[PDB]
Amino acid sequence: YVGSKTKEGVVHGVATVAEKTKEQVTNVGGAVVTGVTAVAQKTVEGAGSIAAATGF
Amino acid sequence: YVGSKTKEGVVHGVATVAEKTKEQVTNVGGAVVTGVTAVAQKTVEGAGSIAAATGF
Amino acid sequence: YVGSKTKEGVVHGVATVAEKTKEQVTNVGGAVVTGVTAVAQKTVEGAGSIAAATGF
Amino acid sequence: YVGSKTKEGVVHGVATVAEKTKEQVTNVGGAVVTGVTAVAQKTVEGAGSIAAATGF
Amino acid sequence: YVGSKTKEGVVHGVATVAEKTKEQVTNVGGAVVTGVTAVAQKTVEGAGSIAAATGF
Amino acid sequence: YVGSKTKEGVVHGVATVAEKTKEQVTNVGGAVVTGVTAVAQKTVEGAGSIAAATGF
Amino acid sequence: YVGSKTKEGVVHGVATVAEKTKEQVTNVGGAVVTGVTAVAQKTVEGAGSIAAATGF
Amino acid sequence: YVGSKTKEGVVHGVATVAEKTKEQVTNVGGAVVTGVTAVAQKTVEGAGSIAAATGF
Amino acid sequence: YVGSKTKEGVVHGVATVAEKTKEQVTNVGGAVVTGVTAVAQKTVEGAGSIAAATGF
Amino acid sequence: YVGSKTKEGVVHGVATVAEKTKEQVTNVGGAVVTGVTAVAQKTVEGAGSIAAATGF
Numbered sequence A, B, C, D, E, F, G, H, I, J: 001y002v003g004s005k006t007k008e009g010v011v012h013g014v015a016t017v018a019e020k021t022k023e024q025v026t027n028v029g030g031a032v033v034t035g036v037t038a039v040a041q042k043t044v045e046g047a048g049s050i051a052a053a054t055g056f
Helices: none
Strands: A007-012 A015-021 A031-034 A040-043 B007-012 B015-021 B031-034 B040-043 C007-012 C015-021 C031-034 C040-043 D007-012 D015-021 D031-034 D040-043 E007-012 E015-021 E031-034 E040-043 F007-012 F015-021 F031-034 F040-043 G007-012 G015-021 G031-034 G040-043 H007-012 H015-021 H031-034 H040-043 I007-012 I015-021 I031-034 I040-043 J007-012 J015-021 J031-034 J040-043
Touching: A007 B040, A015 J015, A040 B007, B007 C040, B015 I015, B015 J015, B040 C007, C007 D040, C015 H015, C015 I015, C040 D007, D007 E040, D015 G015, D015 H015, D040 E007, E015 F015, E015 G015, F007 G040, F040 G007, G007 H040, G040 H007, H007 I040, H040 I007, I007 J040, I040 J007
Parallel strands: A007 B007, A015 B015, A031 B031, A040 B040, B007 C007, B015 C015, B031 C031, B040 C040, C007 D007, C015 D015, C031 D031, C040 D040, D007 E007, D015 E015, D031 E031, D040 E040, F007 G007, F015 G015, F031 G031, F040 G040, G007 H007, G015 H015, G031 H031, G040 H040, H007 I007, H015 I015, H031 I031, H040 I040, I007 J007, I015 J015, I031 J031, I040 J040
Antiparallel strands: A007 A040, B007 B040, C007 C040, D007 D040, E007 E040, F007 F040, G007 G040, H007 H040, I007 I040, J007 J040
16 A cells, blocks of 8 residues: 555545625736635646736 | 546536625736636646746 | 556636626736636646746 | 546536627727636646636 | 556536626736636646636 | 406426446335326316326 | 516526436325426416325 | 516526535434435415425 | 615625535434525515424 | 625535435434525514425
8 A cells, every 4th residue: 555545635524604795806017816616736846826916 | 447437627516696786896906816716627737727827 | 556546637616797887998918817627637738828828 | 436426527417598788899909708608618738717717 | 458447637516506687708918717607627638727718 | 358368387498417337226006106207287176296206 | 567577487597407317206095296396376366286295 | 677687586597516425315204304415485465385305 | 775685685705615424314203304595585464483493 | 774785594614525325214104404504584474494304
């Protein structure tokens, strides 16, 4: 048995309610990331980024 | 048994309710990412990005 | 047994309700990504991107 | 047994309701991606992109 | 047994209801992708893109 | 204007997916009702029943 | 204006996904009601029953 | 203006996902009601019952 | 203006995910009600019951 | 203005996730009510009961 029955990068059983009035975004020459939910990633090699923002 | 029965990059059982009035976005010369939900990725090699924004 | 019975990059059992009035987007010289839901990817080699925006 | 019975890049059991009044998009010299749902991809080699937007 | 009984790039059991009044798109010199649903792809070699928009 | 422009007993915009393996029913001396979907009724006078089961 | 523009007994915008393996029912001398979905009724006079079961 | 523009007994914007393995029911001399979803009723006069079970 | 623009007995914007293995019911000489969701009723006169069970 | 713009017996914006293994019910000569969710009722006259169980 090697690397077996493992759970990795798993999201389960999440319930979300959002109520908003007049949500707004306004970006000039910029990076904006908003609202990421319930995201799971596994990367055997290399670099993994969730919700990452870089300007210029 | 090698690498067997593993669960990796899995999202399950997520319930979402969103109520909004007048949601708006406005981008000039910019990268905007919004609303990602329930996304799962696995990458054996290389780099995996979820909801990542770069300007210019 | 090698690499068998594994679940990878899988999304299941997601229920979403969205109510909006006057949703708007307005982009000049820009990349906008919005509303991604329930997306799963696996990449044996190379780089996999979900909901990723680059300007210029 | 090698690489057998595996589930990879699979999306199942997703129910979505969307109600909108006056949804709008307006793009000049720009890339906009909106509304991706229930999309699954596997790539043995090379790079796979879901909902990815590049300007210019 | 090699590469047998595997499920890859599969989407199943998705139910969608959309109600909209006055949906609009307006693009000048731009790429817009909207409304992709229930799409599955597998690529043994090369790069596979779902819902990807590039301007100019 | 009396009783005008009213909407009553109306069902609209419903999408259903059902997947089953080996569904079964077995009734002796009994009433069974199963699977009613998308049914609308209006009755000006008298009693209206949807999916109602009585034994003996 | 009397009783005008009213909405009564209306169901709209419902999306349902059901996955089952080996669903079963077994009734002796009994009333069973199962699976009612998306049903709307209005009754000006008298009694209206949805999904109601009586034995003997 | 009397009784106008009212909304009564209305269900809207509901999304449901159910996953089950081996669901079962077994009734002897009994009333069972199960699974009612998204049901709306209005009754000007008399008594209205949703999902109501009586034995004998 | 009398009784106008009122909202009564209305359910909206509800998202539900259920995962079960081996759900079971077993009733002898009894009334069982299970799983009611998203049900709305209005009754001008008389008595209205949702999910109500009486034995014998 | 009398009885106008009132909201009464209204349920909105509820998101629920349930995960269960081996849920069971077993009733002899009894009334059981289980799982009521998101139910709204208004009754101008008479008595309204939600999720109410009486034996014998």
